[PDB]
Amino acid sequence: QTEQVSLKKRAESAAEKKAAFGEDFELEKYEEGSKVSKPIEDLQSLDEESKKTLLQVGVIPSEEGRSGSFLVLDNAVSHSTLKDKNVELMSTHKAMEKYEWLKDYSWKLVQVDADKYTAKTYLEDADGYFIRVPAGKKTSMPVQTCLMLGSKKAAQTVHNIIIVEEGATLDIITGCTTKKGVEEGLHLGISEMYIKKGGTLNFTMIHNWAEQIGVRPRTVVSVEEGGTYVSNYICLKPVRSVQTYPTVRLEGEGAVTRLNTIAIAHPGSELDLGSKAIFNAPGTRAELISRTITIGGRLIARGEMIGNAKGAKGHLECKGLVLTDKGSQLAIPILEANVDDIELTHEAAVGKIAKDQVEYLMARGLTEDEAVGMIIRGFLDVGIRGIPEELKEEIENTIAQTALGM
Amino acid sequence: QTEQVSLKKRAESAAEKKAAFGEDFELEKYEEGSKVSKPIEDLQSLDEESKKTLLQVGVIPSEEGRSGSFLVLDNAVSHSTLKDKNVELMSTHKAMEKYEWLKDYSWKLVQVDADKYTAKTYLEDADGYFIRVPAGKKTSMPVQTCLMLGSKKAAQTVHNIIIVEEGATLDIITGCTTKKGVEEGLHLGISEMYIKKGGTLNFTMIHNWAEQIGVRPRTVVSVEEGGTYVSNYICLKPVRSVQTYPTVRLEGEGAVTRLNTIAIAHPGSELDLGSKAIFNAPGTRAELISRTITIGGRLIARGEMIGNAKGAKGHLECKGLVLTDKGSQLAIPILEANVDDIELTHEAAVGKIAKDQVEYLMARGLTEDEAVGMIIRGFLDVGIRGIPEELKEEIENTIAQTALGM
Asked: What is the domain range of residue B239?
């Protein structure tokens, strides 16, 4: 009651608080997306159009090779099912109502007043998914989630909470996409992820938006002793603006994270993509890998490694190709060592594709576009090593078709 | 004429304009340093303390191995002589009185309204040195300049202009220091350097301030076709705050710059040291090397490479050791590719000295302090390759004594 009043106050105070990076959106220009959503008990019953849409972001209507499925359309949960008995999957609202302790995890890692986007999401009483793997259990197959914009020009506000209990493993694939014909809109998605002692969370996220969509995810991950967080973000399709900067706090001894990004910046697009790792306990490790290409958009690769404990080791690699006469690549690392006994290293490279590699492949009988296709496939593949195998084919198709359209 | 009124208006409007980085100084707290000083005709008639002070920052009262000398005490030129009649050396005030055309170079590369420090420097009608090396001519020995703070808590404001004409070469050594017993003060030093087609400017700068001194250099270098700018900055002694971020514009085909920094951040020190290279013509080249150590201060390595022209290649390396339990190392360099046909690369490393290397040297009979000494000599030497040989012995002494006092 006092807590709720104090959070509402803080969130109201942040209504005009711009995010540090990315285009500033006037939230009043977007209608809040529908909080009523017609349930869909069986995803196989959907239209061919919506099924292909799901498939393009790695969401399988048949749930073949999936442990469960969660679907949000605009601001309401449309589907929530499980095949696996060692996972708990519920709407965030329903989880808050079931578990009185869940309030100890809600709006703790992500602050309600971080920026106007977190504030709006809090104030809208955002629903989302709650996913928990109890102690010692491992998901047999990935749980899939899908966040979908269905209205003309609305704001989607989502709040997810993931808890991986001691010694547990959770695999998740999230696809974010749009109804056919949806061109404008905002996605504000707050995710708070808790990995307890010896837990593991593998999280693959594929985005397919539209030319005038703004995207503002805010994600904070807390990794306890001997925990592991692996993230792979894939953003290969046109979109007006994405600005995402997940923070992973390595809180316990030997906590590790591997954070991966692949992206293609299209004309008229700003992609401001970052990763932050905070080394707060001895022996913590991070590998941050970004492989991106611009074909006319603006790409900013941010990476931040904050060394607060002895024995920590962190490495950031950012590479960004510029393929066209329009567009730009920026690499903006931050390495901060606040103790003596630490190793933080980084390499960055931006600019041209290798002319000799293109010419070598053309001599083998390939057009320039085909040659570029093969090179960029190899280049981007480094950033998606070890994603679920099943996802590679569609991703490769997207990369190939991009090269061949140049 | 109308121009002077414009610049004054601009400078006045920026009187309160904080610099983007570094501690903000209240300019009102510093009395402007004396604009009068007794002429010192013979440097060797200087008192032995003053001569020691000069020698500590690489300035030779005897002028052996030197082409000329320029000395500023507080805000007044105290000495200006040349051994040879090729180079032109005069105070900035006297050059501005002599040459109507110098108005085309003065306050052009550095804007009067960049920040409150450039503004103050403009408004105080700062003096300094003007050097011109006539077309095709070369210094046979480096010119030496020295800037000295001599009052209890004064603001020093200097404005220097260097013009290296077509095919010419200038070697310069600058030492910046304080009179004995001087502990507080502010140094504001604006330098505008022009390198014409085929010209070369080799510039070495050694700083030795005091524990409560703030230092705000603003330097812009303009490098024409086939020109070369080499900079070596050395900052090994206690100082409250240094914030410097020279910009080098590579304006003509094949212009090259090599920018080097070595530093040691002492307790209670902030060192915010950057280099910016802008590639504005094809075939332009930059190599930016920074090697620094904290023994309790805060060290920030800034670097920026902006690629605006096809065929450019730039490389930044920054390494920063943290040797003590207090202190921090931050590496924040920036790569920006604005064209496709370009190569920008960088590597950054912050954190520990190599434990195995310390242990190896200790086993050979050395104390920990001696072993650290040998390692940091090797580590910092990378950033002072190519400085005039004569300066190395004193610098190595400083590095050695620092390790040995730990």
From this structure: 1-405
